[PDB]
Design a protein around this nucleic acid. Sequence first.
RNA 1: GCGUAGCAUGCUACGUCAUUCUCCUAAGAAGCUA
RNA 2: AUGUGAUUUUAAUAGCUUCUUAGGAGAAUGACGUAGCAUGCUACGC
Lengths: 186, 185, 529, 590, 75
Amino acid sequence: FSSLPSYAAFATAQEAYEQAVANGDSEVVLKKLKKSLNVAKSEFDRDAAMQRKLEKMADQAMTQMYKQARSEDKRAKVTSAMQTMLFTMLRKLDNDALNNIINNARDGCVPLNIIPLTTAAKLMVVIPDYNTYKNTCDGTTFTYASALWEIQQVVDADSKIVQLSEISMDNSPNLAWPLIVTALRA
Amino acid sequence: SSLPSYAAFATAQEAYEQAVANGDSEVVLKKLKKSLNVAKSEFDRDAAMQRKLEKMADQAMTQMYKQARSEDKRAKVTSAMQTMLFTMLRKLDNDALNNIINNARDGCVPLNIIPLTTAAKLMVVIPDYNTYKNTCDGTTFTYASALWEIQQVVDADSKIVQLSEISMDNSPNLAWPLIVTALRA
Amino acid sequence: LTNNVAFQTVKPGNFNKDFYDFAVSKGFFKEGSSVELKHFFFAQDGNAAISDYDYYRYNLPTMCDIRQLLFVVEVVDKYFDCYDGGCINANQVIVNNLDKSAGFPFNKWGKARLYYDSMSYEDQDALFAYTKRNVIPTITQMNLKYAISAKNRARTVAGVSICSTMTNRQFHQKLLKSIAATRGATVVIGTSKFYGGWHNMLKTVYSDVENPHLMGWDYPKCDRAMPNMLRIMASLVLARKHTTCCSLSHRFYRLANECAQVLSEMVMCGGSLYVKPGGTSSGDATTAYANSVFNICQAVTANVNALLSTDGNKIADKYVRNLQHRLYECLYRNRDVDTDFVNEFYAYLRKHFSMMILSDDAVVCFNSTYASQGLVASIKNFKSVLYYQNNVFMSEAKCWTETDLTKGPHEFCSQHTMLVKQGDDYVYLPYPDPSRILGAGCFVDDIVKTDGTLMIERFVSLAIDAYPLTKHPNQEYADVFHLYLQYIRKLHDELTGHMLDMYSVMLTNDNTSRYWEPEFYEAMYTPHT
Amino acid sequence: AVGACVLCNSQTSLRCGACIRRPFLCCKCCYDHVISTSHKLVLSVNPYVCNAPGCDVTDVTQLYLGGMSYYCKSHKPPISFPLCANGQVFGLYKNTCVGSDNVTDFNAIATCDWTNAGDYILANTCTERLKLFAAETLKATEETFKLSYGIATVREVLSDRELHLSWEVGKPRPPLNRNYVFTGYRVTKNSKVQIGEYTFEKGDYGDAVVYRGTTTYKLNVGDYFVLTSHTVMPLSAPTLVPQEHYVRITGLYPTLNISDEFSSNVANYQKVGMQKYSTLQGPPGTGKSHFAIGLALYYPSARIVYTACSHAAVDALCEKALKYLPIDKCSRIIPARARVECFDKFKVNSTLEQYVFCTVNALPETTADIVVFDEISMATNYDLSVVNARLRAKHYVYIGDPAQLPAPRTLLTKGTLEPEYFNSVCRLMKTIGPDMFLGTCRRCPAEIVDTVSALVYDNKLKAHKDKSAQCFKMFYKGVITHDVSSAINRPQIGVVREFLTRNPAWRKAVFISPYNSQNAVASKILGLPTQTVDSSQGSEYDYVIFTQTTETAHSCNVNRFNVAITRAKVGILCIMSDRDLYDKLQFTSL
Amino acid sequence: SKMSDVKCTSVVLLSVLQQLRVESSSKLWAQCVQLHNDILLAKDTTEAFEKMVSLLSVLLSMQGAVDINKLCEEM
RNA sequence: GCGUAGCAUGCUACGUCAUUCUCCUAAGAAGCUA
RNA sequence: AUGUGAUUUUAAUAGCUUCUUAGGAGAAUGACGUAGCAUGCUACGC
Ligand SMILES: Nc1ncnc2c1ncn2[C@@H]1O[C@H](COP(=O)(O)OP(=O)(O)O)[C@@H](O)[C@H]1O
Ligand SMILES: [Mg+2]
Ligand SMILES: [Zn+2]
Ligand SMILES: [Zn+2]
Ligand SMILES: [Zn+2]
């Protein structure tokens, strides 16, 4: 706007009009000068007010461009996170037993629901009350899923360790049920 | 409206009012019409920007108020909530709540939730012989506006003592604070 | 998944003491009042999530009668004939809110915005077209709901993954947004209760039924007891609009994807994957509309049972006797649809059993003479149908019957209805439960909503909702609107005081003067706009 | 953000600019602080710099608020007004502020440099809030000046995720703490102005740091990061909780027939019980540190928190508690730093026990029944405020003697501080007198206590012991090797070695010297456990080997000799350089 | 208006308890939530007050959490 | 009577500014319902 | 020397409604400027 050649034309027209004011020339010459000054105003406002919309459009594109650059930077970060998650789960797989059970399958397809049941090395039993404890995991070893598990730990709802001698019929009220017992395949 | 543009517009309006009162020739009257219109256009152009700035100022004031008050309200929430709790809890003015609060002020706090079912065990610490005297009478115990029956009085030494030893003359010998285990009646 | 199970609790609501003090100073909450607090923020211990997921044990494997389901399907589809649907490109799907969670495991890395931005349109269409010839099992979390309710049982919602919602939107959204843009149909979704919308709904329900009687039933454990066969039926009725865009294998694999991601899929309930026995998950991409299709199915099955189980020699109207004869013939003696009779029975139902369905909540305007004779479903028919197609007993103490239309349905969408006078005519206005509005004012679910002066739009919206109470005959009910208006006035006064102390100049253009005048709200229940 | 005025507590939003601690200020109070001092920069919710594209005019007396921005005199708009007008600086809560006349002292507290000895006396007799602010700014100034940093500058900007680092050789470098801030100091000539506060945590690969900044400008080539500010934790609790006198023991349950050794202090235990906070003043080795334990044994059911500024005093208290109190039901707290060795005989890091021991800087936000603050002579107002803020306790007991060495105060290098200005409790003791007093030496022989009963105390200290005659006074010149600005005396330690073989009973003594380097090198020369004068306060030692290194002002002060020598339970050997000190002591001439 | 006041005091009291980290002890948070939900779903004021007493006994039992003296003196 | 030029009035087209309203979209806060 | 903390941390699909800001388009009223047509008048020429 203010830097445009049209601004220079308007400025020189205004300077000529002011000089004619200082000159006090005839009305016709002044009237013609006014016509030249006014067309400069329209030309000034023809180019200006397109600058405002020009800069408005440029800013809108730049802000959108900033957004798209940020979008393509979050995509890479989440992709890297997903890759790391998948590979870290891979390193957790018990490959020997998984291979043993999948090689037995005919098509190579086995139901997902048994992949842990026959390959998971650690089992967690959540128990709501004492009767269920006595019926499911009494003692230090128990039998689930046709396997023999040995209880390595027992925690309560507060994640506080609970020694296996504290779980009694009379000591049940003092424990923060449910109890999570963690055992390992034997 | 406190602006130089308004000064120009108002002086042009006054000049045009004087001219129309005079009712002079059309050329000057219509020239003043045009000059008044252009001055008004300039004044309104400036007033639009004034109003835009004023509206931005109002938006900023509102947003600043919201932010300041939200951070203030989040900053002190524990203390405000506790003071509100006790304001309401005094407003209730119940006998049991007042009794347990006035006892807890003196140090006679319960070591476990006060039970509701009949014949349930309550363990309350008693710190003084005056607190013992006011609440304990004979082998009865007045707490929470209810009468409990004392089962077992122990000391800070965890040695079971009997209600006989608890006497004004003998009171200093006992290792306070006592712990009274009682049952609802 | 983790080495230790996670226990999730629910916090209690934050008391708004200023509003409660104002209310009790305005003569509310007195002993023996008709407007008493009943809606509170109930808290739950650590056994909330898994003791609420355990309610899926009410979902038994139900084997629906097939020769009758394959006719209820035709009628229910006739109910969905005004609409149009199909597949849409990834660049036509419009998400409502993009900051909502993205299920599991995607919630670890961002909201739904991250995955709707990271994925171009080309690789969105790629995933969608991948699902049309493949099955993508998916995990759905069970999130505990922190909202005001009238009963202490925990409320749980199934947060479905983004890999499922993206494709289900691309599949269903055309039909789903055509349902929400049609007025005067059976499924009133997308119809507002403002600007004379409730009256229009209640007067299109009365679509010229001879001896009207209003009825409303209730499905106990609607989303946890819905049989798998009927959820599959709803998903297949919603997918009859892809007669051209999709082939048949494409449609079957889309149905398989819906069943694998919604119906019976792995549910992550506090750091542990369980198996969902069945029943609709109430957070998938099509939950209101699928349940609407279910509700119409149950209504039509009740009608069929009521019409067939009728004696047949007692039916005097010789047209209805022949209609029953042909209905039995078309159920248990034909293997191909009979579209003429399907149209005839659909016309019969809409002439004597006008319905209005919102996603589980139905108002019917059934003919009374036929219902007494037994030629159209009544409450006992619905109870029987629910007993043998849901494995739940629909107690008659929660389903209402209204014999007088001049006071509208007893309760639809938790809004009672009342016939008031507006201008020169009479209109039905919905008013809520006053206890609900009072408990929404008193118990906010955050500590910054307790300030009040920050939240005047909260009370403006609550007053918009509670305006109809002003026209209630019970004065203690009508006082709630004026309570809210006076509280808004006080909030604005003290807001101006605080903002005039925090500065030396008050707001230049404070146009809050219209929120404490009844005209602004009075204009919200007038048909003009 | 808003806050409260330091010196009137009214709501406000005007922080000052050139104060180290970045305080909040009221309107009138800010006008008086900026119109009278050299501090001119002011921070409202937005700074008060000029808003021209290039201009730096921060003097609030000049700027004008126009529209919604601030412009200097030259760039002023037509319609505006100045900020500093009508006796106030424009800000929030303009006309709900009440000023105060305490700006006469606040100006001095925020203006001074804490190097003179008038600054410290000013920061101990003003109002409580001014006391707290002065202590806070003093700690900040110490952390900025003493052991400050080496000038670091980023060579290049690899990325905004990780910055580059280059420490200047010749000066040390402080580590990461979000409380540290390294001001930006691009000092070439182009806008030498703070470009933000930054903290630097180095990575595990190469030369790169994952910095955390507070501004939004990329690092220039010449930009440097200079440690010119540290953000101490803002403290709130007063230096001393208000006193309230009782008529009976409340919250504490006395015993009968407590013991034989502590029978004399029964009345003093009652006095502790009957007041909120009590102060015990006792010359060294007179029995304060076991008076705490006797307090414990007189209120067995009362949970107790022993706390002290240093680690030696808490360790001495641990020794005595293990010797007298049930070892099982005690504890000891160690910080996450775990830098220094501690007393590992109780169940460590067990806060919920009935007898906790801790350093004031590592206390947990808990309660108690009585908190015994030991050796307040080493306590600044900051430590008192911290212990008051963290530990809510029914009874406070401040035990200490001002005559012993004060806190370091590294900045203090001119003038001298009287005992009664070390902190608030010392002022209370020396002004209105201690609440308890017990002067009778019980640790060191009668000879040495008789010696010290004239230098510092006017023979008001009695002794109940026998002169062991094992107090050897030796006059060895001890040529000085001023190596690391800490005197090392090789001839002195050699002479100790040659006379350490002559004394079979002194082979397990303890080495003390007023210089850290000498103490550290004494360990290798002769293998004794060395402990400097500063960190040996509180412990008890049987045989002590002291070596006054140089004739100076550090090692020559009487109080440091007092605390160094009074630690000898049965005997001590002292080497000397100053003759005047040699003139008045009563030791064996050797 | 005393019945509709215990129901609000219980909400405030349970918020206070949850801000003191009673949520971290399941055996106690279960009882607190039971008492809260029972007070809210109450009709007779006597039962509500009795459960209010039992629930406030949780807050009074823990000594290091609140400072009853300071909070009660002000009111 | 015709032309060129000038002024006033009316109308049409275009350019710019101000006011009001409607909608289309985008973003943000909030409320209710299933 | 006081943040080797805390980002350790859940919150669905869909509908309607209120409020705020920004952009665009459209409409209407008014004002100034340029061009075009018509009427009235004036200077000169024919
Ligand atoms: N009543 C007493 N009788 C005999 N010896 C005591 C008595 N009280 C304390 N002591 C001895 O005096 C020493 C005082 O130690 P301490 O309290 O550290 O001195 P201070 O506190 O004066 O510096 C203890 O080591 C203890 O053995
Ligand atoms: Mg001592
Ligand atoms: Zn399709
Ligand atoms: Zn300053
Ligand atoms: Zn400037």
